Structure 1
Amino acid sequence: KTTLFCASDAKAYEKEVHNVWATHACVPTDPNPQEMVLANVTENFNMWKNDMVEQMHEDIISLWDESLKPCVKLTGGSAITQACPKVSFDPIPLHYCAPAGFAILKCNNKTFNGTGPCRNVSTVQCTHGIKPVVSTQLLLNGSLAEEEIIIRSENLTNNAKTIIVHLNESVNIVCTRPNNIRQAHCNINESKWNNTLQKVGEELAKHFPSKTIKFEPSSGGDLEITTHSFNCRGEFFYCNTSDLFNGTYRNGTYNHTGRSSNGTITLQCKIKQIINMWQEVGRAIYAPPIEGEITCNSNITGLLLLRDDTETFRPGGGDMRDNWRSELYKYKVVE
């Protein structure tokens, strides 16, 4: 309804680029913030149409211009060339704050699906701290749902609408290029992955009850969405998830069809230099990988899925606003 401002712990001394950008762009966070509670109020919310998501999207686009300059950017006819130094890159949390005369309502119902009426409501200055993590397929380093796994969708009956699975328990994923030098891999403990898809399958069955629930790899598209793609320490990782989204939830029980060894699923990754951009329709070209070990230890906190008797779910992504939705779903700007 209005233009929000960002607050952060950034550090004028960190040369990490999120810190630099936030020192320029954000104000410091208020050390004790005021919440109010209002359980009588009940208001309505719609995570799929939230101006906060657009404002954040704009900020993160700007932060990626400042911070991860491509050596070459092609959009339309034009190629744009500029210096592309290697940088220190580690996302920091950002708070979105309502300006004077404006407030942010937070939905306190622990099981709110992002849509409709919410009974217990609060007013706040600012959202919680949201790390702006760019990825497809898996949502990384988010905040977990406090009670059950939540299924969010603009319209579950419309198979073209992205599904966000909000996990109540995180799944560790460790991705590393060790010190071919594009080659990398991710490890996930099969026990957890196995549990969580059983539990996701149970919820998905609640919404599609007759059907058997299967998980299968991404059918097609650009490599950024057919693999789990993300940025680790500046480098763009593309990680095959054929062994991850590979399973059947038949009859109260999940079977994992993907292959594992020593109870560990291992994803083969490549570090790439030609990137299909998430900011606009275009290509960006970056320099070859920095040397040594590149490792990111992350928590999977959510999934992005697309639906195709049987209902069958494949990993999705591509529109980074959904990532911001998955964190901003409980907030609305008012007055």
Structure 2
Amino acid sequence: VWKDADTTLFCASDAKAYETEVHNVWATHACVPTDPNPQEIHLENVTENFNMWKNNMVEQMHEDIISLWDQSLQPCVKLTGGSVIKQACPKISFDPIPIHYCTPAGYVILKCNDKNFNGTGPCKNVSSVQCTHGIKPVVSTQLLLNGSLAEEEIIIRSENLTNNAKTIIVHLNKSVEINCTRPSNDIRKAYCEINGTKWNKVLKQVTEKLKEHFNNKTIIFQPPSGGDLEITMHSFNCRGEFFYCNTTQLFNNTCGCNGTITLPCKIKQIINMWQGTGQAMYAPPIDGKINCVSNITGILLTRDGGANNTSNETFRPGGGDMRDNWRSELYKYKVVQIE
């Protein structure tokens, strides 16, 4: 037996206790060693309801990544509502490692193993676990990077597809490598290379899956309509530096267009922090090639409103609520208490 319950979990990771990498250093002193002998205990013919849009686990992962970043990625200056703070900001080594979220005795995590589970609703293949899987705290917008992939057809996750204000998460079943670089020796100019032939292939598929949820209909893509730079550009952190990338060449409906699409990017110093509060200035990029090859495994979409009288739905990349970023890997988990 069990009851829908919330508690205070602990974390686990394979952090190498010697590395200077910020994540390892933080997980070394804030997480326990990964369970060496873990086991799924299959709850046969048990059907439990899940919900990833109202999950405390997300919030508990948020507090960690807010803490980890604030312990390691310190800005030279914090313009937090006037309270401008000058402090130290040495360049560091930044590469996320997997983190596990375990329950204390008296509770357990129920993991939905349905291959087509969309995050909400009921699950029929429930199994019980003590620690989640190695989740990578990847901070990014528009595109979800370095995550897990749907084990079947493309899944469309949303707290309510009808409400257009609720964000749409797309869990791809095939990753698309995005390769970003800042050439050695303007030091903020950079670019991301994406195979245009796989992107549109996968982009086509997303449309197909999106038509199913909107009474077939016409599904068009358009760049974001206003907002802060962090959301109009595909923002992400690579080797510690903040890359801003113009995804105008990906969210056009052009598709003689299937070569290597090169995205213009800029390493930005003034960042509109994702943890909340305000702005923060960082030091200029390190010398050398700042290269990060990453898997696109999801997309942050936001549908336009008012097309109820029209015959087409417009979709624009979203982001900025990193809670929906962890939400894309914690969807299959849920904390219940052993009553």
Tell me if both proteins adopt one fold, taking TM over 0.5 as the criterion: yes
Percent identity (aligned): 80
Q: Which residue of 2 aligns with 1:299?
A: 295
Alignment of 1:156 with 2:157, yes or no, is: no
Alignment of 1:277 with 2:273, yes or no, is: yes
Output the CA distance in 2 between the equivalents of 1:156 and 1:312: 13
Aligned counterparts, 1:1-80, within 5 A: 1-80=6-85
Aligned counterparts, 1:116-265, within 5 A: 116-179=121-184, 180-247=186-253, 256=255, 263-265=259-261
Output the CA distance in 2 between the equivalents of 1:119 and 1:83: 51
1:183/1:269 contact within 8 Å kept? yes
The one-letter code matched in structure 1 to 2:267 is: I
Unaligned runs of 5+ in 2: 1-5, 305-310
Output the CA distance in 1 between the equivalents of 2:251 and 2:100: 33
Q: Which residue of 1 aligns with 2:283?
A: 287
Output the CA distance in 1 between the equivalents of 2:44 and 2:247: 42
Output the CA distance in 2 between the equivalents of 1:222 and 1:47: 26
Q: Which moved more, 1:264-273 or 1:31-40?
A: 31-40
Output the CA distance in 1 between the equivalents of 2:103 and 2:61: 13
User: Structure 2 length as normaliser, TM-score?
Assistant: 0.94
SS at match of 1:201: helix
1:274/1:284 contact within 8 Å kept? yes
Output the CA distance in 2 between the equivalents of 1:264 and 1:312: 26
Deviation of residue 210 (structure 1)? 4.4
Output the CA distance in 1 between the equivalents of 2:216 and 2:71: 50
Output the CA distance in 2 between the equivalents of 1:89 and 1:228: 18
Q: Which residue of 2 aligns with 1:251?
A: none
Output the CA distance in 1 between the equivalents of 2:44 and 2:190: 49
SS at match of 2:327: helix
The one-letter code matched in structure 1 to 2:244 is: Y
Deviation of residue 207 (structure 1)? 0.4
Give deviations 1:164-192, integer Å, cap 9, x for gaps: 00000000000000111100000110111
Superposed CA RMSD in Å reads 1.0
Q: Which moved more, 1:205-214 or 1:224-233?
A: 205-214
The one-letter code matched in structure 1 to 2:316 is: R
Output the CA distance in 2 between the equivalents of 1:293 and 1:195: 30
Q: Which residue of 2 aligns with 1:113?
A: 118
Q: Return structure 1 stretches of 4+ with deviation > 6 angstroms.
A: none
SS at match of 2:132: coil
Q: Which residue of 1 aligns with 2:336?
A: 334
SS at match of 1:279: coil
Number of residues of Structure 1 aligned to a counterpart in Structure 2: 325
Output the CA distance in 1 between the equivalents of 2:44 and 2:139: 34
Q: Which moved more, 1:322-331 or 1:211-220?
A: 211-220
Output the CA distance in 2 between the equivalents of 1:222 and 1:2: 35
Deviation of residue 101 (structure 1)? 1.1
Deviation of residue 39 (structure 1)? 3.6
Output the CA distance in 2 between the equivalents of 1:323 and 1:11: 25
Q: Which residue of 1 aligns with 2:323?
A: 321
Unaligned runs of 5+ in 1: 248-254
Q: Which moved more, 1:316-325 or 1:190-199?
A: 190-199
Output the CA distance in 1 between the equivalents of 2:119 and 2:204: 23
Give deviations 1:209-258, integer Å, cap 9, x for gaps: 242111111111110000000000000000000000111xxxxxxx51xx
The one-letter code matched in structure 2 to 1:111 is: N
